[PDB]
Amino acid sequence: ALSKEILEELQLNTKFTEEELSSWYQSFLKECPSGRITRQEFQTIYSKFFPEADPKAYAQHVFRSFDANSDGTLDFKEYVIALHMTSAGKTNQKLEWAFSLYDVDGNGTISKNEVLEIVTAIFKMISPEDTKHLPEDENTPEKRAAKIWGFFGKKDDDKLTEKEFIEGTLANKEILRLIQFEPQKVKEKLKE
Ligand SMILES: [Ca+2]
Numbered sequence: 704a705l706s707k708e709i710l711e712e713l714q715l716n717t718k719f720t721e722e723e724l725s726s727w728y729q730s731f732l733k734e735c736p737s738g739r740i741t742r743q744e745f746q747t748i749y750s751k752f753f754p755e756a757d758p759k760a761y762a763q764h765v766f767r768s769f770d771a772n773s774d775g776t777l778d779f780k781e782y783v784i785a786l787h788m789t790s791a792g793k794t795n796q797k798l799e800w801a802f803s804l805y806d807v808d809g810n811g812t813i814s815k816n817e818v819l820e821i822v823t824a825i826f827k828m829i830s831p832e833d834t835k836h837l838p839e840d841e842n843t844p845e846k847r848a849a850k851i852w853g854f855f856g857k858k859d860d861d862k863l864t865e866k867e868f869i870e871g872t873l874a875n876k877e878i879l880r881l882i883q884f885e886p887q888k889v890k891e892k893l894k895e
């Protein structure tokens with residue numbers, strides 16, 4: 704079963720009860736009997752549930768951000784939190800995690816190329832139809848990433864720190880809009 708400690712972390716990021724999480728876990732074990740889900744299996748979830756998208760890159764990056772020990776798997780806890788990160792809960796409490804998403808190589812700072820990589824992965828989550836609710840100045844990943852880097856006041860070779868990333872995503876709501884990683888929130892912003 705689930706340790707009381709894991710259950711304690713799964714309510715900072717979910718609102719399911721202990722019994723509910725345990726039932727999901729039992730079902731998880733039938734499909735993933737090692738208690739681990741691989742990157743390809745995780746990607747398959749996203750490919751299935753985002754049919755209008757090309758979600759492979761996005762799902763790979765989300766997976767990476769949660770594979771804390773880099774063993775190529777997520778355990779149940781990490782998988783539950785990952786799904787919730789992409790799909791549930793309020794945005795502002797996710798900003799620290801978002802730093803780990805954007806810091807692709809895990810070296811502790813974000814580079815311009817890393818912003819482009821993640822912006823591109825998220826951009827591919829936008830449907831064909833919604834891709835024309837895109838303003839001209841924001842209609843390619845290159846343009847969106849360029850704007851983000853500009854809002855951070857950065858030169859090409861500069862490194863963006865965690866301190867600055869959190870400040871900017873809290874304070875500048877245009878940075879927030881552009882770095883947004885939940886596909887439904889990206890979609891709703893494009894329409895609204
Ligand atoms: Ca980095």
Ligand code: NA
Pocket residue numbers: 769770771772773774775776777778
């Ligand atoms: Na892992």
